[PDB]
RNA sequence: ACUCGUGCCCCGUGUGGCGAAAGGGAAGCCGGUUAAUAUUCCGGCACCUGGAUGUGGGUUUUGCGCGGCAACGCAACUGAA
RNA sequence: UUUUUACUUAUUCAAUGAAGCGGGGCUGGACUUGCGUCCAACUUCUGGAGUUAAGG
């Protein structure tokens with residue numbers, strides 16, 4: 167009348183589990199995507215060393231949001247200035263803001279990009 | 288087709304120390320969960336201890352044939368359902384809308400009586416003709432006095448198997464006690480037959496066994512040990 | 522009603538039947554957890570007397586405390 | 589007065605026994621069906637020094653009667669036991685040095 | 690295993706987290722460059738991990754390489770529990 | 771009434787992955803004459819291997 171048990175240990179039987187099907191959302195409006203491009207990119211850096219590498223290395227220096235990562239910075243640059251980069255280096259300055267060195271692709275000139283879109287000369 | 292020459296036997300010698308044991312049924316010694324363990328040990332303890340007669344009288348229940356006869360009678364008098372009550376109320380509503388008084392369209396109902404307090408009051412007033420007490424009332428207290436009350440009031444009773452059985456008879460989950468007071472004339476003879484059969488086939492047999500204490504039955508190994516001791520002595 | 526009989530029986534805590542029931546239930550409760558939900562009151566008359574009702578929203582919890 | 593050193597020793601703290609270099613306690617096999625009814629054969633793999641213990645310990649490997657695995661035990665080595673020695677544990681084990689009866 | 694998530698079939702003795710910038714541990718070197726950083730920037734030349742699918746090569750077609758007495762070798766040269 | 775020793779289910783201890791506990795009956799035997807009882811279950815030459823069953 168009883169089932170055969172080949173193991174001397176008892177395991178909790180697996181039972182059906184159901185996904186949540188709430189009859190009301192807990193929050194009504196999903197939040198808009200925080201940290202979009204307009205928040206990611208703040209302003210270009212126009213110091214001596216920032217402008218030096220625009221010519222010497224074909225890279226643009228920006229001040230970006232402190233919680234933005236390299237992928238977000240790359241996507242924001244592409245969306246906001248149609249800029250394609252080969253790599254982006256980042257640091258956090260002693261003042262607490264993030265500085266990003268974005269090296270452009272060799273076919274695009276950082277001087278023209280800065281002159282026409284960034285207002286830098 | 289004859290068997291090919293290269294099929295042969297590889298019997299396994301499961302003796303001590305020469306082969307891995309086969310996967311046999313180990314259901315006798317599984318580490319059961321605590322609720323199962325307590326469930327079985329509870330029954331074991333009630334068998335081991337001496338049960339006072341008032342509780343021990345409940346292990347003598349109605350036989351299968353007598354229970355079948357009793358339920359055959361009772362299934363004609365199980366109470367009305369929700370739909371039946373709604374239909375009766377609707378037709379009474381048409382009656383008193385027509386102006387004919389209530390209880391003219393409907394007739395006197397004959398139904399089995401349930402509910403512990405209601406049944407106790409019925410047998411106290413001697414209106415109950417036959418009482419069936421469930422044998423497995425979780426707090427036996429609720430029914431431990433019922434056989435004595437029925438004996439005092441001179442009403443035939445039977446301890447029947449199935450609290451859930453009485454419940455499904457009466458359209459509930461459990462009933463724990465059932466009483467029949469009056470039946471229709473077409474089966475008053477059936478009621479008399481059932482009462483006489485219940486009396487002479489349960490009460491007369493349990494007249495003496497209901498007075499003795501519940502057994503202090505020991506376990507299987509203890510019983511075997513005592514048998515061996517007695518056999519060796521003799 | 523049977524609750525009057527239950528009330529009268531509960532006074533006879535020294536009788537054989539009540540003593541047996543108390544001993545067995547004490548063993549069971551000792552085997553159970555120190556605090557645990559009880560499906561129904563084990564003393565229906567006492568619970569109803571103290572205000573328990575058999576409807577949704579009423580809960581019985583059994584607890585043992587060191588003596 | 590103060591709490592004396594003998595009283596302080598029972599608190600634990602700095603008087604707890606050192607255990608890092610101790611690999612396993614020296615225990616027999618759990619008493620099983622094979623040891624109760626017949627015997628079981630084990631192989632001595634190594635004789636090791638247990639820090640804090642004067643006696644050496646013997647690592648002995650047995651087969652599991654019920655599974656394909658193999659089980660290594662840690663016995664107190666009896667003098668005369670050696671690596672690669674067969675020892676036998678059970679009711680029917682022979683009466684030789686290192687056998688558990 | 691299905692057009693579609695939800696149908697089953699096996700194994701089980703275990704069944705948490707934190708805790709090392711000197712313990713364990715995948716992988717980067719040289720040259721040059723700034724006022725201030727660099728094994729991080731620039732140039733050249735590399736490596737590791739993970740994921741994908743190609744070209745060639747190898748092996749086989751009732752099947753999963755060959756050689757050396759051997760220690761072993763060769764660019765691979767199926768492999769669940 | 772007091773003491774002693776019996777039971778196991780209260781209670782307490784120990785082991786384990788809670789695997790072989792207790793009764794038997796099939797066989798193997800060895801001991802005995804109103805054919806009757808007791809024992810046992812297959813691993814000891816070797817630092818190998820033993821698992822996902824062969825068969826009826």
Ligand SMILES: [Mg+2]
Pocket residue numbers: 256257
């Ligand atoms: Mg960095």
Ligand SMILES: [Mg+2]
Pocket residue numbers: 577
């Ligand atoms: Mg409820």
Ligand SMILES: [Mg+2]
Pocket residue numbers: 589590591
């Ligand atoms: Mg002091």
Ligand SMILES: [Mg+2]
Pocket residue numbers: none
């Ligand atoms: Mg950590």
Ligand SMILES: [Mg+2]
Pocket residue numbers: none
């Ligand atoms: Mg380190």
Ligand SMILES: [Mg+2]
Pocket residue numbers: none
């Ligand atoms: Mg590099």
Ligand SMILES: [Mg+2]
Pocket residue numbers: 731
């Ligand atoms: Mg470089």
Ligand SMILES: [Mg+2]
Pocket residue numbers: none
């Ligand atoms: Mg790769």
Ligand SMILES: [Mg+2]
Pocket residue numbers: none
């Ligand atoms: Mg090819």
Ligand SMILES: [Mg+2]
Pocket residue numbers: none
């Ligand atoms: Mg023979």
